[PDB]
Symmetry: D5
Subunit: 163 residues, 10 copies
């Protein structure tokens, strides 16, 4: 309901942007652009709308938005954890990436959020979150909690297996 009500307001602002750039919004290729740009921005912010072995999900494709300039940034996320008593469904790990990445973000915050989500949900022995992105030269942010921070064997294993 919030998206359907805000969609016109976004398209109105996108039409204003086209006009403010010294461009004609009534052009053939630019007629549908305010609506399309609004729909795209809605998709990039849809997140605002859930054993005794190391479990890793590497190369998770991640699409987020720079909260400073409103320019997207793509990347990859590699999550790892050592369960205590609760295990998370591998599809749900990707949903955690998606909820936080589809938002006006900062890579450092986005990493911290994915690690905290896992920690709070499973209460595991250790968690490892690596985000490697190219912002529109790479930026790598890494969160190591529990046994992932304290155990050299555990951290070396996580870092090696995600390569």
């Amino acid at each position: 309901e919030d998206n359907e009500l805000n969609l016109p307001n976004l398209a109105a602002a996108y039409s204003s942007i086209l006009s403010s750039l010294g461009e004609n919004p009534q052009r053939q290729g630019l007629l549908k652009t305010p609506w399309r740009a609004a729909s795209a921005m809605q998709f990039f912010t849809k997140g605002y709308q859930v054993h005794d072995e190391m479990v890793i999900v590497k190369d998770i494709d991640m699409f987020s938005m720079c909260e400073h300039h409103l320019v997207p940034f793509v990347g990859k996320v590699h999550i790892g954890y050592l369960p205590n008593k609760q295990v998370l469904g591998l599809s749900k790990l990707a949903r955690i990436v998606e909820i936080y990445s589809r938002r006006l973000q900062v890579q450092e915050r986005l990493t911290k959020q994915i690690a905290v989500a896992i920690t709070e949900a499973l209460r595991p022995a250790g968690v490892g979150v690596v985000v490697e992105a190219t912002h529109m030269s790479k930026t790598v942010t890494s969160t190591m909690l529990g046994v992932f921070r304290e155990d050299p064997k555990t951290r070396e294993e996580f870092l090696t297996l995600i390569r």
Copy 2:
């Protein structure tokens, strides 16, 4: 086999597809035979040197027990023997018995490591399963593989 083929014929009809098509006439039997091969590990029981022994890149083919969709990957096994050494052909047979079942990657990894441990009673074991159901890597480190940093670093490096 005829009960599986009957269910596969029902699936073809339920999908808005003509089961009497040229290419779909033998499909209920072929699909039933394929599903039997993907679950052949149920027909088998596990009952059938002072150095690190590794067998890497073991091709694994398994079936997700949630959606009945195959998942394919590779298994890397390593162990430090105590008094019993396993024939390298038999390590692959353990992977085949558990992978040809309706599996969950985590359980499959747990099973292959326990099978080795119970069979050889080794100083340590290391089982790594990397599969594509974005990749999922599950790793079991038992004994000296868990406790010795030198041993674990060596297994992980040699499987690359």
Copy 3:
């Protein structure tokens, strides 16, 4: 659409499969499996629900299009990549729409050879271009390649398409 009416009939057949495999369908991890397996099979054949419907002097290529299809012989999925190229005559297709053509035909009970012919004909009929090139590589790998018009007849064109998809 009709997938709402056939969903319980597909779930029933999947439960029969679980029982026929010497497995307990009332297991913790196998309880909602007849529903999940039925929903998965409907997603792998969603291309049947869509129609062919849709809406420059240079070679246009879209390579590494992820393809997921289902072998019509054994009902086992086959996965690959599609590489499409064309030289327009007067009509150009939106690059997003090229991928939607791949999706319509790949989400069905297919044979790789038929699939690639299906995409090739869809583009030809839609744009009426000077040439078309469709390469499907799926999994030992199987590569099927359709070269039409200037892509078949011009050696320079075909070499260019094949080089640019690498």
Copy 4:
């Protein structure tokens, strides 16, 4: 002058976008965002501010980093450009080939159009024996490759094979 006058109008529209997303525009990290976004959008469309105004060998400039804007959704698309030409009587300074890429890429584009524009700009500037322009970009994990072959690059099989091999 046009940019300085339109900058507050762009920032006003960007502040409206922040509010329309269910986000607090008075947040610490979002206070300067309408101005920063407006300045960024101005840089992505700076091409509009600019105007396009003996040898016997193939000249190539490959892996030219390209940053452009999808005219359809206003989402950036990034790739690389490979340019080649066989001169007739006029040769272009290798720095200037990249400036042609920049003028056309810093606009609301369609990959096909941008590719054609670079090739026509070179053809009109040098009047060469042939031009080759390959643009590969990532806008679903797949790449889009557009290719313009003019003159001897289109007609000579030896020339086209050589260009395509040397850009690899």
Copy 5:
């Protein structure tokens, strides 16, 4: 060749393999060699299983099946040679099931072979079965690699077709 012939000849192969172990200045009664004459006999039977099968039992686009794992035996020294087979064809009116394509390779490769002959044998099988416009067979093996290549019909005569085959197999 039949399964009855194999079961009857298996003890005669194991007897010859035990004689080989003894002739090498090796103790056939040591732990690791107690089952070796029979394992060697069974292995040799598997490397020559293609003799048990017959070729009889087994669209306007190029159809290629690349990276087909091949395991064969050198008929000169009885030492295995391993490689990869790349097959391609342009159909006329008959198309072969892609599973059956690699089954042609398993028939000729599981015999006492010479790479050149095995390559020719594969290409002729496809040509005789389908009667296609063109065929292409490439065998690359390590007995320094040995590559044998057969190009028939449109694959030999059309430069565009051969270039396409050779590029797509890479």
Copy 6:
């Protein structure tokens, strides 16, 4: 230990067993390409087991990596080929780098089990040089690879030494 007189005397006995194998496989031993095969196979088997004819008697990490290894599976008499990576920290005696490869050759040219081969190379070095530590890695293909690793002395006990060996051999 085996000698050249033993080989010349056992050669017809090996060829006789190889002729029996050809006949037992449902194959014509009088074929053009199979006439000399019993002798060629016997000569090849003698070369694969030539290590039986030889005896081992005749302040920095030192590594010799990518040593080509060719051995014979003692279970089925089928060759297995791989690579050996050797490393050692000398105490007072250094071995000529050519001689490290000769140790590989003596043990690999025999009916082997990969684990045994690795142990033998490591023990031969240890006994010859009496070094601070030894490292022997054998990676072989008998699509799946088998890696065996022996770490003795400072290579087993020092984490710095083992990490260094393992990294330098890549």
Copy 7:
């Protein structure tokens, strides 16, 4: 300052062309004294700037670096990899690159240049640890790698292993 700095540089570059044995009035050499002076100004622009302008490891790798050899005035080019574990202050990722640019755009020595980047970060953020890796190919086939590890990056084996692995 830079207005009255560039003419003196172009004058010296014209003198160099004449001293080499070249004709500075040649077609391709007419603009060369100014272009060379503008290039040398760009390689030393870091003199014009001052440095005054979460619980996780933060890395920025593959930063392109262009510097001047202070011994022979020959450019040296490479990459910088930066990492840090914050205490209470985090630096904007754009600003890390500006520190690289400030010190690299000077008459440098790779060792000094590396040390300067690390000290600038340490003094600005006061972090738990810092890691700086500079790889470069000088014109003085062989590569020069310089590495500074401060705080927890020097003392913690887990921390250093991780930064060195993540920069690959």
Copy 8:
């Protein structure tokens, strides 16, 4: 000549000392005291190819290639070095060139104030004039985004088989 270099060395060092003073730095610094002389000597080494003459430096029927020849030239526009690789190929007619001498050809033209296009052409012409071959191929790839310049003469230009072969063998 060597006399010209010795006489112009203090004039180059004087201009380099002026450059140090014009960048915003102290020329009397410990590490910058010898810099005007070192920079002058470096610039002399980058232009040593002006001191050499091509003159200063048999029937086969096969393509002869020398690939991955390290090249270090100086851009004549900004006096900034450009570095790359040269790939040379030729089909001899009656004379063959010593493989060491092909690298000396690269050195004489690359150690000058160049434009990559001119540098490629000079090497190709030097080979053509020296051997009088059936064909010549010169592919220079440098980083001043890479710049590739290619000269195809004789049978290398006219024969499609010859050009495809040279281009494939240099990979």
Copy 9:
């Protein structure tokens, strides 16, 4: 012949001992005592080819390890040979193709001559429709010499195929 090699071996070791002395080096050092005989054996092995004599599908043997000697300075050069042939009515055993390479490689060579010799040996032995010989050696810069005879020179399809398959 093998008799000539065994008889010339002490004359080579004598010359190698003289070389050690002429270099301002102690020929009586621990590591240099066996060097004149080892250097002699090595040079003999490098020129081993002198004692030997030259006695419907594309056939290729690629990545043949080649070890030769530069006839100008007596310094070894090492590379790889790729051979291809299209037979007329005569086929050569793949083991024998490598023996031809060994014959000519193991001499005081010039890469250009060595490529011509391998190609001529195949041509004369089989009388094929075409021959292709590629030698790539390092005497950071590599030297590639290529001989294309018959159908390999004349047919563009044949040459493209040979060049592609040797990669």
Copy 10:
């Protein structure tokens, strides 16, 4: 130390031995191409052993590495050249060495009749004696013509031997 007078005097004695080698190989020394070979071989052998003519005599807080140094030496067992790469690393105490001079140390010791184990040791000792650093790491990876297989010799001194963090870092950064 060897000198230019020693080289000029020994050149005809080297060429005489090289002419004897040509004759002993069943080859015609008077061939058009082999006429200058005894002199050229003697001159080449003099260049491969030019390091005998030279003598070694002629605060930073960071690891300094120079990797991929092209090395060209001569196996003292068979007089066959061996070619490889040298990777040098050091942690300075108070003195830093000019990066050009690190390569000159490689050249002085590689241009001699060597054994890789010795050459590695010699470069490490030369650096240690010159700078007196906290640690030194020298890796040589070469391919010998004693057939094919690579030989890697590694010297770790000071903090490079004793500190696991230092050794892991050097080994990772030379890759």
